[PDB]
């Protein structure tokens, strides 16, 4: 269980260091891998001190298994109880120190990154003038135990050595020892202190001294039995005790090894040396390997502050040193970007900083008060330095991760790099107004790309609280809010895959009274006065409601843009003004009823409109007619099924997509509303159950349904129409 498990990996380590034959270390490796993760959790303290020493030594690519043990410990050594990383932070530093030259062949280097996210020969000694009295006091406390052993038997003081009287020449008091036998006591002590003192371990001392004199035959001699049933252990007590025990028994064991070295490679069973000695043959040696250490430890001996972030805080260190090294390295080497370890460490520290911890919010949640602000600011500023540049390392998606750390929005008085990024985006923040070759970064191919719109959508996202300055709601945010809003037609240029992919962000101040008071504001902010943004943000809701058409495919982006400022997404004065929550949301719900249901408008143009009791019955009747059309279609397909690949499979896939999107927008809150209506009223229950039954009858089962649902799930697994029917039956 815990006898000699951990030393087998040490055996295999010593074999792996010198494995001359090939096709041998690769088989020794699984015996290291799987033996650890088979029974036990807490065995990874005696072993990986060697792994720490070897990580400090080098990072050899033949020895990639040494990194792979850490790269599986990152997931599997974390069993149920979630412990700390000081002794794991130190190999991160050494792994950085090894990372500096090469950093190109990724198969080994992945082990060194995510460790922080989810978490003897002796030459000569110059001994001091203090260590001469431990040996004189050794017999003072061990002759008590020798007499305690011997007084149980027949040995006792007498006159001269004789077998009848049962005397020995030893049995005098602990000072009056004869010179004919003197070194038998004091031989096996000082050859243990060499391993400590030569390398530099410590034998420091208190100012207390005699402690166990209080804490428990000529001369009045009787022994003082030091207690054996109480002991505790730590890193230094383990290191000291294991070291001295290794010194005694492995000195003796090296003599046995030299016997075999002279024998010439024998093979006979009765031999074990210390360093992988099982504990069964250990108790005799351990009764005095520890009791000498009892005499050393509690006889008046010891051996060995504002916890700031960089000073002591391990939770802070991974953020602090990483962000400092990043802002020193790549912020300086951005000039090196635009015209060995430069690009290598650049691409290393890129993802070591973007994903130092995958929970970018949690690492900056409560790890420390001010460090989240400074580190998020350094990350955002470093991203803003290289946001324009077109190197190969992509970080547009991880910029969303760094931006999600902000609302999970500190005080931006420490630095205005957020305003710097706001100005960098304000070069072409109004997308269709300024769409040209003079677009963001003034690029043709540098920063003008598809990642800019997605970074505007997700990276510009403060949903927890818009508690920033927002002083540029009259000037900078007003520019992208107004120049967009100059016309209902979005007016996108070429490569306009989605004009709504700028974002869904707009609200009442988040031409206008704030910017009209330009000299006054430039602190009468636009968010303070709610009537002025609510007037000219909400006036064009009647425009988009008036804008419609019988042909649904024409007005694709009519509902999408109107829904962002229309419904309850406009949190600014949504509870204050009932118009934004009630009437605008009713218009934004009623427009998809006429728009999305039409077969002219394909599902692609209105794929993901992520954003009412009056409209609930309308959607119920319309979806009942739509499922009836799908069921008549299914009856047509069953009767003389034509080539499904041409239009039938695509038609069924589009019908399933539309029905599933309607069912999901129902499942948000309208399904619960319809269930409450069904439980309350039988007429509403029968109305919801009729169309639902017409849907479930056609959507009972189909091979084309299975294939199209698998395609929809792989692109975006059919919709759970059975679950909706069960909810409606629980209502009815």
XYZ file of C-alpha atoms in Angstrom:
732
model
C 0.000 0.000 0.000
C 2.704 2.443 1.116
C 5.726 0.210 1.682
C 7.829 0.396 -1.518
C 5.477 1.763 -4.177
C 7.234 5.100 -4.926
C 10.773 3.746 -5.429
C 9.866 1.677 -8.505
C 9.622 4.889 -10.493
C 13.077 5.758 -9.105
C 14.399 2.381 -10.299
C 12.902 3.069 -13.710
C 14.341 6.603 -13.590
C 17.878 5.324 -13.027
C 17.298 2.806 -15.819
C 15.932 5.518 -18.131
C 18.921 7.823 -17.576
C 21.335 5.154 -18.909
C 19.114 3.025 -21.166
C 21.718 1.999 -23.750
C 19.455 -0.355 -25.788
C 16.713 1.180 -27.893
C 13.167 -0.243 -27.746
C 13.736 -0.521 -23.949
C 13.009 2.891 -22.401
C 9.756 3.037 -24.390
C 8.617 -0.127 -22.567
C 9.947 1.066 -19.208
C 7.864 4.234 -19.601
C 4.354 2.645 -19.220
C 5.480 1.019 -15.962
C 6.105 4.564 -14.694
C 2.906 5.990 -16.222
C 0.259 3.473 -15.216
C 1.724 2.264 -11.905
C 1.180 5.689 -10.341
C -2.451 6.142 -11.457
C -3.708 2.682 -10.335
C -4.224 2.710 -6.519
C -2.852 5.708 -4.630
C -3.035 9.509 -4.537
C -0.384 10.800 -2.117
C 2.897 9.330 -3.352
C 4.244 12.257 -5.434
C 6.501 13.891 -2.821
C 9.369 11.428 -2.363
C 9.649 10.796 -6.112
C 9.472 14.119 -7.993
C 12.185 15.829 -5.988
C 14.298 13.931 -8.478
C 12.014 15.177 -11.244
C 12.400 18.712 -9.908
C 16.185 18.328 -9.871
C 16.126 17.011 -13.443
C 13.807 19.775 -14.634
C 16.262 22.237 -13.120
C 19.053 20.281 -14.843
C 17.865 20.443 -18.461
C 14.981 19.820 -20.886
C 16.207 16.983 -23.108
C 13.946 15.736 -25.888
C 14.947 12.107 -25.443
C 13.675 12.794 -21.909
C 10.266 14.065 -23.074
C 8.647 11.439 -20.830
C 9.855 13.518 -17.871
C 7.713 16.379 -19.180
C 4.896 13.969 -20.040
C 4.658 12.777 -16.427
C 4.021 16.390 -15.438
C 1.683 16.813 -18.426
C -0.522 13.983 -17.157
C -0.088 14.912 -13.465
C -1.671 18.257 -14.428
C -5.025 16.422 -14.792
C -4.642 13.168 -12.827
C -2.480 14.110 -9.835
C -5.297 16.537 -9.030
C -7.532 14.009 -7.310
C -10.468 15.060 -5.113
C -8.842 17.725 -2.881
C -7.312 20.610 -5.056
C -3.890 21.521 -3.544
C -1.194 24.199 -4.119
C 1.720 24.756 -6.542
C 4.869 26.197 -4.856
C 6.998 23.133 -5.629
C 5.110 23.086 -8.973
C 5.718 26.798 -9.570
C 9.481 26.288 -9.309
C 9.641 23.875 -12.299
C 7.486 26.375 -14.213
C 10.298 28.883 -13.705
C 12.921 26.321 -14.724
C 10.727 25.286 -17.672
C 10.613 28.901 -18.807
C 14.408 29.036 -18.365
C 14.688 26.005 -20.644
C 12.067 27.432 -23.016
C 14.179 30.427 -24.052
C 16.389 29.038 -26.908
C 14.430 26.521 -29.025
C 10.571 26.683 -28.695
C 9.558 25.307 -32.177
C 8.588 21.576 -32.146
C 5.280 21.557 -30.308
C 4.970 17.866 -29.358
C 7.076 18.235 -26.175
C 6.273 21.827 -25.197
C 2.528 21.444 -24.496
C 3.366 19.708 -21.191
C 5.076 22.827 -19.784
C 2.205 25.316 -20.323
C -1.043 24.253 -18.620
C 0.520 23.185 -15.299
C -0.576 26.494 -13.715
C -4.133 26.784 -15.086
C -6.141 24.155 -13.145
C -4.157 23.459 -9.980
C 25.333 10.992 -3.020
C 28.938 12.090 -3.594
C 30.833 14.186 -1.035
C 34.339 15.650 -1.354
C 35.447 17.711 1.651
C 33.992 19.438 4.727
C 35.028 22.396 6.913
C 32.983 21.779 10.072
C 32.679 24.647 12.605
C 33.906 24.938 16.198
C 30.394 24.116 17.596
C 29.908 20.458 16.582
C 31.939 18.654 19.257
C 29.442 18.219 22.156
C 26.571 16.370 20.442
C 28.782 13.279 20.460
C 29.665 13.726 24.142
C 25.944 13.908 25.037
C 25.031 10.964 22.765
C 25.953 8.288 25.322
C 24.436 10.432 28.124
C 20.985 9.623 26.657
C 21.620 6.323 24.815
C 23.296 4.503 27.749
C 19.974 4.959 29.541
C 18.365 2.927 26.760
C 21.235 0.417 26.605
C 20.859 -0.183 30.355
C 17.070 -0.321 29.885
C 17.613 -3.126 27.381
C 20.195 -4.825 29.589
C 18.533 -4.550 33.020
C 15.598 -6.620 31.731
C 18.107 -9.463 31.294
C 20.665 -10.620 33.876
C 23.373 -8.032 33.158
C 24.234 -5.815 36.138
C 27.306 -4.113 37.652
C 30.029 -6.293 39.157
C 33.800 -6.631 39.630
C 35.352 -8.178 36.465
C 34.267 -9.948 33.263
C 33.032 -13.478 33.972
C 30.324 -15.688 32.494
C 29.007 -16.815 35.893
C 28.411 -13.346 37.356
C 27.055 -12.103 33.956
C 29.182 -8.939 33.695
C 30.682 -7.155 30.674
C 33.566 -4.647 30.421
C 31.038 -2.093 29.093
C 28.846 -1.817 32.188
C 30.262 1.277 33.889
C 28.441 4.637 34.063
C 28.153 6.766 30.951
C 31.272 8.888 31.738
C 33.599 6.222 33.187
C 34.231 4.294 29.951
C 37.630 2.658 29.550
C 39.972 3.483 26.658
C 40.144 -0.200 25.636
C 36.646 0.175 24.097
C 35.761 3.788 23.159
C 34.874 4.132 19.417
C 32.108 1.459 19.347
C 29.617 4.062 20.600
C 30.669 7.129 18.589
C 31.509 5.578 15.194
C 28.135 5.718 13.357
C 27.055 9.359 13.849
C 29.422 11.751 12.064
C 29.385 9.959 8.692
C 25.676 10.992 8.511
C 26.276 14.718 9.093
C 28.522 14.881 5.991
C 25.524 14.603 3.648
C 23.867 17.554 5.352
C 26.805 19.867 5.951
C 28.792 19.351 2.726
C 25.836 20.146 0.471
C 24.778 22.855 2.954
C 21.816 21.622 4.974
C 21.591 23.167 8.411
C 22.198 22.038 12.006
C 21.108 25.333 13.612
C 20.158 25.528 17.277
C 17.906 27.422 19.666
C 18.983 29.159 22.883
C 16.939 26.670 24.972
C 19.280 23.685 25.268
C 18.326 21.031 27.808
C 14.620 20.358 27.139
C 14.080 16.606 27.594
C 15.716 16.578 31.046
C 12.286 17.520 32.412
C 10.285 15.756 29.673
C 11.093 12.072 30.232
C 22.963 0.218 40.630
C 25.796 2.578 41.539
C 25.309 6.382 41.083
C 21.568 5.937 41.763
C 21.283 5.121 38.067
C 17.880 4.329 36.567
C 16.985 5.016 32.921
C 14.849 7.865 31.577
C 12.765 6.406 28.748
C 12.057 9.039 26.104
C 8.553 8.505 24.741
C 8.266 6.580 21.451
C 4.513 6.803 20.618
C 4.554 10.508 19.585
C 6.149 11.890 16.419
C 5.366 14.241 13.518
C 7.102 14.845 10.195
C 7.469 17.557 7.538
C 9.741 18.413 4.593
C 12.831 19.117 6.697
C 12.319 16.385 9.285
C 11.740 13.885 6.451
C 14.772 15.184 4.536
C 17.028 14.986 7.601
C 15.827 11.580 8.816
C 15.785 9.986 5.346
C 19.233 11.468 4.700
C 20.865 10.086 7.849
C 19.171 6.679 7.487
C 20.333 6.617 3.869
C 23.845 7.482 5.042
C 24.055 4.588 7.537
C 22.355 1.785 5.643
C 23.493 2.811 2.121
C 27.117 3.109 3.311
C 26.720 -0.503 4.489
C 24.873 -1.291 1.250
C 27.664 0.116 -0.907
C 29.957 -2.327 0.876
C 27.598 -5.128 -0.217
C 27.598 -3.613 -3.728
C 31.405 -3.696 -3.806
C 31.339 -7.344 -2.684
C 29.183 -8.057 -5.738
C 31.380 -5.791 -7.894
C 34.319 -8.031 -7.005
C 32.221 -11.188 -7.497
C 31.627 -10.325 -11.172
C 27.903 -9.934 -11.729
C 26.291 -12.637 -9.649
C 22.591 -13.225 -9.159
C 21.487 -14.365 -5.683
C 18.437 -13.263 -3.674
C 19.536 -12.136 -0.197
C 20.353 -8.459 -0.811
C 18.563 -5.082 -0.705
C 20.218 -1.600 -0.445
C 18.601 1.363 1.325
C 17.505 3.625 -1.519
C 14.744 1.212 -2.579
C 14.534 -0.767 0.686
C 11.165 -2.178 1.681
C 10.012 -1.281 5.193
C 9.823 -4.889 6.458
C 13.578 -5.136 7.183
C 13.692 -1.560 8.538
C 12.255 -1.509 12.084
C 15.505 -2.397 13.891
C 17.477 0.257 11.996
C 14.569 2.716 12.418
C 14.325 2.362 16.216
C 17.667 4.286 16.467
C 17.717 6.084 13.103
C 14.764 8.077 14.519
C 15.726 8.098 18.209
C 19.052 9.755 17.358
C 16.913 12.296 15.494
C 14.642 12.560 18.544
C 17.769 13.401 20.557
C 18.757 15.924 17.881
C 15.402 17.632 17.299
C 13.616 18.436 20.587
C 16.814 18.944 22.668
C 16.659 22.688 21.983
C 17.260 22.630 18.217
C 15.579 24.126 15.145
C 16.442 23.790 11.448
C 15.261 26.066 8.639
C 5.418 39.687 6.588
C 3.241 41.433 4.002
C 2.515 38.618 1.535
C 2.415 40.818 -1.540
C 1.768 39.424 -5.001
C 5.290 39.105 -6.417
C 6.797 38.733 -2.913
C 5.133 35.558 -1.567
C 1.689 35.108 -3.161
C 1.780 32.051 -5.414
C -1.654 32.978 -6.751
C -0.236 36.357 -7.724
C 3.140 35.183 -9.073
C 1.820 33.418 -12.186
C -0.049 36.571 -13.204
C 2.632 39.081 -12.187
C 5.788 37.565 -13.660
C 3.953 36.452 -16.806
C 2.436 39.866 -17.538
C 5.659 41.697 -16.649
C 7.732 39.444 -18.904
C 5.134 39.782 -21.672
C 4.979 43.590 -21.529
C 8.794 43.619 -21.467
C 9.314 41.060 -24.240
C 6.682 41.287 -26.971
C 5.778 44.937 -26.379
C 9.460 45.645 -27.112
C 9.776 43.046 -29.900
C 6.742 44.354 -31.803
C 9.289 46.508 -33.607
C 11.081 43.225 -34.348
C 7.818 41.872 -35.809
C 7.368 44.580 -38.440
C 10.342 44.826 -40.808
C 16.156 31.988 -32.711
C 14.304 32.379 -29.426
C 12.713 35.681 -30.456
C 9.792 34.275 -32.448
C 9.933 30.975 -30.537
C 9.543 32.534 -27.098
C 7.108 35.033 -28.637
C 4.716 32.284 -29.718
C 5.332 30.477 -26.417
C 4.552 33.418 -24.151
C 1.650 34.441 -26.432
C -0.434 31.457 -25.334
C 1.206 31.277 -21.904
C -0.245 34.777 -21.360
C -3.534 34.365 -23.210
C -4.102 31.114 -21.263
C -1.886 31.344 -18.194
C -5.153 30.325 -16.536
C -8.129 29.283 -18.663
C -10.440 30.999 -16.164
C -9.127 34.457 -17.010
C -11.873 35.924 -14.816
C -11.159 33.533 -11.929
C -7.415 34.239 -12.014
C -8.348 37.953 -11.802
C -11.530 37.460 -9.727
C -10.218 37.560 -6.134
C -6.574 36.489 -6.433
C -5.745 40.021 -5.231
C -7.415 43.420 -5.205
C -5.245 45.581 -7.477
C -3.456 42.819 -9.400
C -6.524 41.953 -11.489
C -6.713 45.565 -12.670
C -3.014 45.926 -13.498
C -2.779 42.514 -15.170
C -5.949 42.892 -17.242
C -4.728 46.355 -18.251
C -1.310 44.990 -19.242
C -2.934 42.168 -21.225
C -5.363 44.489 -23.017
C -2.608 47.010 -23.777
C -0.291 44.300 -25.088
C -3.112 43.021 -27.272
C -3.737 46.571 -28.501
C -0.061 46.940 -29.455
C -0.169 43.869 -31.722
C -3.874 43.953 -32.671
C -3.057 45.628 -35.997
C -0.062 43.463 -36.894
C -0.466 40.419 -39.139
C 1.900 37.842 -37.627
C 1.020 34.149 -37.712
C 0.062 33.776 -34.050
C -3.719 34.155 -33.969
C -5.201 35.592 -30.761
C -8.599 36.970 -31.841
C -10.524 34.235 -30.017
C -8.372 34.430 -26.879
C -8.913 38.201 -26.900
C -12.536 37.340 -26.125
C -11.227 35.339 -23.157
C -9.163 38.298 -21.946
C -12.143 40.621 -22.508
C -14.384 38.299 -20.485
C -11.985 38.751 -17.554
C -12.956 42.456 -17.441
C -16.611 42.032 -16.310
C -15.541 39.118 -14.057
C -14.876 46.129 -14.987
C -12.504 47.469 -12.338
C -11.695 51.149 -11.778
C -9.989 52.422 -14.944
C -8.220 55.340 -13.213
C -4.957 53.371 -12.901
C -4.470 53.476 -16.680
C -6.504 54.312 -19.794
C -5.380 51.488 -22.079
C -9.090 50.684 -22.377
C -9.579 54.151 -23.851
C -6.518 53.509 -26.029
C -8.204 50.414 -27.457
C -11.432 52.421 -27.774
C -9.549 54.967 -29.885
C -7.843 52.228 -31.918
C -11.296 50.796 -32.663
C -12.665 54.317 -33.267
C -10.537 54.558 -36.436
C -13.233 52.428 -38.121
C -15.727 51.764 -35.318
C -18.647 52.862 -37.487
C -18.423 49.824 -39.745
C -20.519 50.624 -42.853
C -19.978 54.384 -42.661
C -16.182 53.926 -42.918
C -15.964 50.576 -44.750
C -13.277 51.076 -47.418
C -9.574 50.348 -47.865
C -9.213 52.913 -45.001
C -10.968 50.445 -42.629
C -9.641 49.536 -39.137
C -5.826 49.723 -38.937
C -6.077 51.413 -42.399
C -5.412 47.882 -43.716
C -5.951 46.007 -46.929
C -4.865 42.750 -45.236
C -3.224 43.601 -41.872
C -6.098 44.005 -39.371
C -9.035 44.476 -41.766
C -10.305 40.900 -41.706
C -13.157 38.757 -40.405
C -11.710 38.653 -36.868
C -12.374 42.383 -36.343
C -16.170 42.025 -36.440
C -16.113 38.985 -34.149
C -13.787 40.776 -31.720
C -16.204 43.707 -31.762
C -19.075 41.316 -31.038
C -17.534 39.200 -28.258
C -14.447 41.169 -27.219
C -16.547 44.314 -26.798
C -18.750 42.749 -24.128
C -19.357 44.279 -20.684
C -22.623 42.598 -19.695
C -21.961 42.412 -15.944
C -21.798 46.192 -15.569
C -21.050 49.177 -17.864
C -19.283 50.897 -14.956
C -16.441 52.300 -17.088
C -15.938 55.998 -17.813
C -18.106 56.171 -20.970
C -17.340 59.881 -21.289
C -17.104 59.365 -25.087
C -20.818 58.524 -25.417
C -21.100 62.059 -26.864
C -17.907 61.893 -28.982
C -16.459 58.409 -29.659
C -19.262 55.972 -28.846
C -21.632 58.538 -30.370
C -19.667 58.304 -33.628
C -20.171 54.560 -34.074
C -23.690 54.804 -32.595
C -24.833 57.640 -34.907
C -22.936 57.054 -38.167
C -24.345 53.541 -38.048
C -27.763 55.002 -37.139
C -27.672 57.605 -39.963
C -29.890 55.234 -41.971
C -31.932 52.073 -41.484
C -30.191 50.460 -44.445
C -27.020 48.998 -42.963
C -25.201 49.726 -46.254
C -22.435 47.117 -45.911
C -19.600 46.881 -48.414
C -18.225 43.701 -49.977
C -17.329 40.753 -47.728
C -20.389 41.613 -45.595
C -21.068 38.132 -44.257
C -23.134 39.604 -41.412
C -23.737 43.309 -40.821
C -25.120 42.467 -37.357
C -21.771 40.811 -36.475
C -20.498 44.169 -35.192
C -22.335 43.391 -31.949
C -25.611 43.457 -30.100
C -24.589 46.257 -27.721
C -26.686 49.359 -28.341
C -28.923 50.865 -25.668
C -30.000 54.317 -24.472
C -26.616 56.089 -24.340
C -24.415 53.020 -23.939
C -28.841 64.865 -32.536
C -28.590 64.040 -28.824
C -28.784 66.186 -25.685
C -25.369 65.137 -24.347
C -23.405 65.889 -27.521
C -25.630 68.944 -28.026
C -24.198 70.143 -24.695
C -20.712 69.573 -26.055
C -19.023 72.403 -24.172
C -21.039 71.504 -21.064
C -20.252 67.779 -21.224
C -16.895 67.962 -23.005
C -20.376 66.218 -16.754
C -23.899 65.964 -18.195
C -23.378 62.527 -19.693
C -25.860 60.998 -22.156
C -26.621 58.136 -19.753
C -27.791 60.572 -17.047
C -30.586 62.181 -19.078
C -32.626 59.185 -20.257
C -35.166 61.057 -22.406
C -32.656 62.136 -25.062
C -31.195 58.674 -25.881
C -34.610 57.045 -25.455
C -36.104 59.453 -28.003
C -33.747 58.947 -30.957
C -32.739 55.347 -30.199
C -36.397 54.253 -29.995
C -37.873 56.463 -32.750
C -36.437 54.220 -35.485
C -38.177 51.206 -33.908
C -41.351 52.477 -35.592
C -39.298 52.818 -38.780
C -38.156 49.188 -38.735
C -41.651 48.062 -37.726
C -43.029 49.979 -40.708
C -40.288 48.514 -42.908
C -41.461 45.047 -43.943
C -42.456 43.099 -47.046
C -44.557 40.148 -48.144
C -41.418 38.564 -49.600
C -39.484 37.498 -46.514
C -36.089 36.876 -48.149
C -35.655 40.578 -48.988
C -35.898 41.912 -45.409
C -33.380 39.550 -43.831
C -31.660 41.980 -41.442
C -34.824 43.968 -40.630
C -35.741 42.130 -37.423
C -32.158 41.542 -36.255
C -31.020 45.159 -35.942
C -34.401 46.273 -34.607
C -34.379 43.575 -31.914
C -31.121 44.720 -30.272
C -32.452 48.152 -29.251
C -36.119 47.057 -29.401
C -36.690 44.346 -26.813
C -35.545 44.051 -23.207
C -31.870 44.021 -24.305
C -31.915 47.834 -23.989
C -31.293 47.666 -20.249
C -30.825 51.456 -20.060
C -34.200 52.694 -18.763
C -35.958 49.426 -19.641
C -37.632 49.346 -16.225
C -38.007 53.143 -16.253
C -39.661 53.435 -19.681
C -42.239 50.686 -20.154
C -42.123 51.315 -23.934
C -38.730 49.628 -24.461
C -39.695 46.490 -22.530
C -43.347 46.177 -23.627
C -44.167 47.789 -26.962
C -40.782 47.604 -28.667
C -40.403 43.976 -27.584
C -43.916 43.258 -28.882
C -42.975 44.729 -32.266
C -39.684 42.793 -32.315
C -41.651 39.606 -31.518
C -44.435 40.238 -34.050
C -42.081 40.982 -36.954
C -40.589 37.426 -37.019
C -44.166 36.075 -37.168
C -44.638 37.545 -40.650
C -40.952 37.386 -41.630
C -39.375 34.099 -40.561
C -42.333 31.787 -41.242
C -42.300 32.494 -44.995
C -40.649 29.838 -47.153
C -39.133 32.581 -49.346
C -36.726 33.692 -46.612
C -34.287 30.808 -46.266
C -33.102 29.736 -42.830
C -29.541 30.947 -43.508
C -30.374 34.663 -43.768
C -32.213 34.535 -40.391
C -30.317 31.639 -38.823
C -29.532 32.913 -35.294
C -31.905 35.663 -34.076
C -31.002 34.967 -30.435
C -33.368 37.708 -29.178
C -45.659 37.276 -25.540
C -49.146 35.977 -24.775
C -50.656 37.838 -27.736
C -47.979 36.511 -30.096
C -47.967 33.083 -28.397
C -51.254 32.020 -29.997
C -50.078 33.516 -33.300
C -46.876 31.458 -33.194
C -48.925 28.427 -32.121
C -51.250 28.696 -35.124
C -48.403 29.551 -37.510
C -46.214 26.682 -36.289
C -49.231 24.370 -36.449
C -49.725 25.344 -40.095
C -45.972 24.979 -40.679
C -45.854 21.520 -39.091
C -48.962 20.623 -41.106
C -47.117 21.701 -44.253
C -44.134 19.612 -43.136
C -46.454 16.644 -42.508
C -48.088 16.990 -45.932
C -44.528 17.136 -47.262
C -43.658 13.933 -45.375
C -46.758 12.264 -46.820
C -45.628 13.372 -50.281
C -42.133 11.977 -49.640
C -43.424 8.618 -48.387
C -45.619 8.310 -51.503
C -43.108 7.827 -54.349
C -39.971 9.102 -52.641
C -37.911 10.873 -55.303
C -34.151 11.481 -55.196
C -33.762 12.832 -51.665
C -30.412 14.522 -52.364
C -31.762 17.221 -54.701
C -34.343 19.271 -52.738
C -36.236 16.933 -50.392
C -33.452 16.441 -47.850
C -32.589 20.149 -47.945
C -36.275 21.081 -47.674
C -36.754 18.793 -44.669
C -33.546 20.135 -43.116
C -34.692 23.741 -43.552
C -38.157 22.906 -42.202
C -36.587 21.146 -39.216
C -34.277 24.130 -38.679
C -37.176 26.603 -38.744
C -39.359 24.420 -36.507
C -36.492 23.826 -34.062
C -35.647 27.536 -33.935
C -39.302 28.371 -33.265
C -39.421 25.617 -30.649
C -36.266 26.925 -28.964
C -37.515 30.515 -28.892
C -40.623 28.956 -27.347
C -38.487 26.921 -24.909
C -36.849 30.136 -23.644
C -40.000 31.415 -21.849
C -43.011 30.954 -24.162
C -43.077 27.187 -23.582
C -43.432 27.738 -19.833
C -46.026 30.433 -20.581
C -47.986 28.024 -22.792
C -47.715 25.309 -20.132
C -49.130 27.648 -17.485
C -51.887 28.643 -19.921
C -52.680 24.985 -20.645
C -52.847 24.140 -16.941
C -54.983 27.243 -16.318
C -57.233 27.060 -19.418
C -58.424 24.014 -21.395
C -58.909 25.976 -24.624
C -55.297 27.155 -24.646
C -54.174 23.641 -23.739
C -56.088 22.173 -26.685
C -54.732 24.895 -28.987
C -51.121 24.238 -27.979
C -51.620 20.445 -27.955
C -53.180 20.347 -31.454
C -50.266 21.894 -33.329
C -47.801 20.109 -31.054
C -49.468 16.777 -31.844
C -49.445 17.564 -35.570
C -45.713 18.262 -35.221
C -44.949 15.138 -33.175
C -46.926 12.899 -35.547
C -44.752 13.993 -38.477
C -41.655 14.260 -36.236
C -42.202 10.846 -34.616
C -39.293 9.180 -36.429
C -37.636 9.287 -39.843
C -34.299 8.316 -41.358
C -34.172 11.597 -43.277
C -35.104 13.310 -40.006
C -32.233 11.519 -38.252
C -29.729 12.463 -40.964
C -30.877 16.089 -41.189
C -30.889 16.396 -37.392
C -27.365 14.977 -37.213
C -26.333 17.500 -39.869
C -28.004 20.346 -37.963
C -26.320 19.292 -34.712
C -22.902 18.913 -36.350
C -23.267 22.303 -38.047
C -24.859 23.992 -35.025
C -29.489 15.254 -32.914
C -33.037 16.461 -33.491
C -35.072 18.852 -31.401
C -36.630 17.349 -28.264
C -40.208 17.467 -29.523
C -41.001 14.601 -27.139
C -39.852 16.798 -24.245
C -42.089 19.658 -25.402
C -44.998 17.223 -25.733
C -44.316 15.914 -22.221
C -44.307 19.466 -20.849
C -47.562 20.243 -22.671
C -49.089 17.034 -21.290
C -47.977 17.985 -17.780
C -49.798 21.257 -18.451
C -52.865 19.651 -20.057
